[PDB]
Symmetry: D2
Subunit: 315 residues, 4 copies
């Protein structure tokens, strides 16, 4: 998986993720309105009037299990695989806000309006792993971003690390610190035209565009996707309207797309970008296309009764 965040001229949020896996989970566009009554698993605090929330996920035990979601105030969050590094406790800790791992995305989007608020509240949060019936435990880290910045939440054996995501991007293993250090190997690549030069008597000129970008890895592994999508996201010209920014989002995530036949998993099946999701705070709209249908479908917040009380799943 790959998560991307960027802003426009007016401070709006643009946020999206690739879902790379070998099979579908039957996920769907999921709307949890403000009047929906939710009881947190470990009695975690919340807001009196919660926020409207839309995203992609599944429903289990009448609870919205969000793969990624956003609220009506420009805050969004996604969950990405982190096994071999993620480590959670299975028992609540008193004195802290105990949140189940599956409910962390819904909890963030419902009770907070900014990355600033999330960062301070996390200073007293215990992420507790409670096994869900029939599914092996998920070992994830989270990518949270608003209109100004993004953070990475990596709960590991030695505690919880909250990183300032200066590249506004995230993938999978290994640690976020490794990925930021790894970027320094590629610090000389450029999107400019390769300047003509000579090695001794040999004159060197580029055939055309892209030679200055040589060095960027092309494989679909987690560290290489991080470098590729960080370069793409950092060099994309800033856009100023909804359609162009949504186009920027899906094209940036498309730069690290996983095509059928590229890479097998431990199971022996090919991992592929099953769907690409996205959110815009300028219009409070969720966007999505799939591997079999690249046409971007839109799901606005303003055409669902956000005061209703039941979960809405749009096929």
């Amino acid at each position: 998986c790959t998560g991307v965040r960027f802003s426009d001229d007016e401070g709006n949020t643009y946020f999206g993720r690739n879902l790379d896996w070998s099979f579908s989970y039957g996920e769907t566009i999921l709307v949890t309105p403000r009047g929906y009554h939710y009881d947190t698993v470990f009695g975690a605090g919340g807001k009196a009037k919660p926020n409207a929330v839309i995203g992609v996920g599944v429903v289990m035990a009448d609870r919205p299990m969000y793969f990624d979601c956003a609220n009506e105030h420009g805050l969004a969050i996604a969950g990405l695989n982190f096994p071999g590094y993620a480590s959670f406790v299975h028992e609540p800790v008193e004195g802290t806000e105990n949140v189940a791992t599956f409910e962390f995305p819904l909890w963030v989007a419902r009770n907070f309006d900014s990355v600033d608020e999330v960062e301070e509240t996390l200073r007293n949060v215990t992420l507790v792993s409670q096994i869900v019936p029939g599914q092996q435990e998920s070992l994830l880290h989270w990518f949270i971003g608003d209109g100004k910045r993004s953070i990475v939440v990596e709960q590991m054996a030695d505690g919880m690390h909250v990183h300032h995501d200066d590249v506004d991007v995230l993938t999978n293993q290994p640690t976020f610190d490794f990925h930021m250090e790894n970027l320094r190997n590629y610090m000389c690549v450029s999107n400019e035209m390769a300047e003509p030069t000579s090695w001794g008597k040999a004159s060197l000129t580029a055939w055309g565009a892209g030679v200055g970008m040589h060095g960027i890895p092309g494989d679909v592994s987690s560290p290489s996707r991080f470098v590729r999508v960080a370069y793409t996201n950092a060099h994309y010209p800033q856009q100023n309207d909804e359609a162009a920014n949504v186009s920027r989002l899906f094209h940036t995530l498309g730069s690290v797309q996983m095509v059928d036949g590229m890479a097998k998993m431990g199971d022996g099946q090919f991992e592929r970008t099953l769907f690409t999701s996205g959110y815009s705070s300028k219009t409070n709209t969720y966007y999505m296309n799939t591997y079999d249908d690249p046409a971007i479908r839109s799901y606005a917040m303003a055409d669902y009764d956000m005061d209703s009380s039941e979960l809405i799943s749009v096929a």
Copy 2:
């Protein structure tokens, strides 16, 4: 730019290309019906009953100028920029089928039904580059394929090279032989899960998928795009239906897409995949999507009066 070709179990053609440029020429889905009368520039002959042709291009001086086109019999062709390597004569040659460079895609699609036919008649073809004063000359090489195989036509100062394209893939500079030699650098790359191993006492395991693919370049230069798209086309599992094959073709071309901001051209503007076209001989249908809209449109030959005599265009 990048050309891609593959087939299904039934032997149907699947052909497409990315167009990566900094601006648009106003190109458009263009239909050349059988009844449209065309006069070759230097009198090259062809079918008395030409084939129906659909593709993407422009109309100049009432002539259809195709960027890439296909016919009703499963033969397709694409023109890709080849400056610094492409070289043509400026005057025709007596005794040979002299074809202008801009009319080469149309002339191939109208008069030939297979790649074997094109390769045979190319042994007596002279590609003439007509000199237009107030415009630079188009310096292209071509990617021609049907249901069975593809070939690369690279006309250079030392003659016309017709290559058997075993990777079913083409980009830009340099010569095709360079690209085929360059793939040998990456012959150890694999799409399998990286097998655990040891360096001395240190056990090495992959974080997950993709580590066996390590070594493939990710830049948008012409040589790196050749390797990445040849890897993807060769390792893509064979598909059974039209929807899966059309989705395979666009996803294959999407692996070497040029995103805004990645690379500037000599004149300062970024190079982007403005559009991606496709063709399927199973339904004789052209496909296309754009940088501003990823939805794949379809344009079947069955939806146009192929017996008419006027070029049909559908703008964007």
Copy 3:
């Protein structure tokens, strides 16, 4: 700078060190005899009868400042630059064995006989940085190895980290955990001849040796050097005698040599492997050659009065 350790089939120590810098500091072969009296700066406790020690370094205030050194029992230690990550305290700690950073190599070699002994007492060692007012601060990390295994000592702000160096290799920045994670990118390279394979119809064969090794970086940066020399150390065939093992040591280190003109440092000067030092516990001998003289020169412990009381600096 690169450090390399390996062992023969008899359990002997082979320890090597590249010193990559832009100028020399006057270092020579420096012998510290068993009868030489030395007072630890912060009163750290050592052996009653110290070990004989030989290595490369300078003499400051009649104190052996060792770049790298080994003892008569097969234990060796090398200091390599670690600025930007190395952070020490400036005052001693009560109840701990406080060791100054500049004396850590001499302290390790004189008082210990294996990496097990070193790793054990390191759980109570505090490395202190005594800043000379006119000089800048020395910020190093250390590579310690014997005949069985090696460890890496990286003292940082969040404490002292002691790593089990399973690749028996150390370079420079960043932390050792990064380098070991980084190796997982290259786990698919191979010293075997690349097996012929096919991409679609394209048959791919290697021109010759080395194609299975494609992927290994070739630049002289710190992470790229770690990857390249860890690959070479892990794939070097085992040697039985001494001359071949000393040859293995200098060829492995030579795989990541810094040639003049390859890379400029901050001051605009070029960085070069000024000398390459080595040690063999089978013969208790130090070896060394320089950028200007590739001939390896030996300095045997049995050639010096190890019972004397004066530092012996060997010139020429």
Copy 4:
């Protein structure tokens, strides 16, 4: 293998090569004096007063068969493996200078005084490959240099190609124009300290020296060795004395040395830099070290009877 040429401020020749193989042929330093009489296999003419020649090679049928050699006027030549591309006729051609492949280095060194002269004569030269029934036929290309420039001689099925070697460097397969095209992939690497930049809000800096060099491949394949040694040869600062330039010649070739264990060849054995030989026109001296002894041995032309009439050889 790898060939390398460069010069100093006074225009002297500095020429050398690595020998990478799985075994040795018993070759030695080999002096061919002027008085030695040589009857060319196919009647190729030459000077009345031949030049004195020295190099590394073997003696077969009282003929000196050099791996690499140089004459007293500063002209050198080496032969490097080229199977799969090298193709020779097996019969002489009337009207030309028919030179056998094994006598090509000696013929060039004994009869010509500059690269300019060899270039002019090669226009009427036929490279004839005379095969023996026991051994396999040698398929090589040649690296010829002097105090000014170097050229590459690649005899192939479609004729003989003589390239101007702008990088003054040669390795093995594929063709020379592939390697010169391939260098363009790396045109952005630099020996300068990487300049601090930013990706968005993230500030990127180099750990130290060598990050600007990131991109150069580190494997021992023929294409990767070409890129890495061309880079190293091109950025080495010029030197103006014999000792500094012999050091440069061996350090530059050492940047593409084959270390034991890096890569197996077709028959399962590891390939290694068995010896590294060099030549200097300033002193008319041949140099040589080996995998086992890095000490550089010198063999001056003025230490042999260049007026004698029999081959002189230096055992081991």
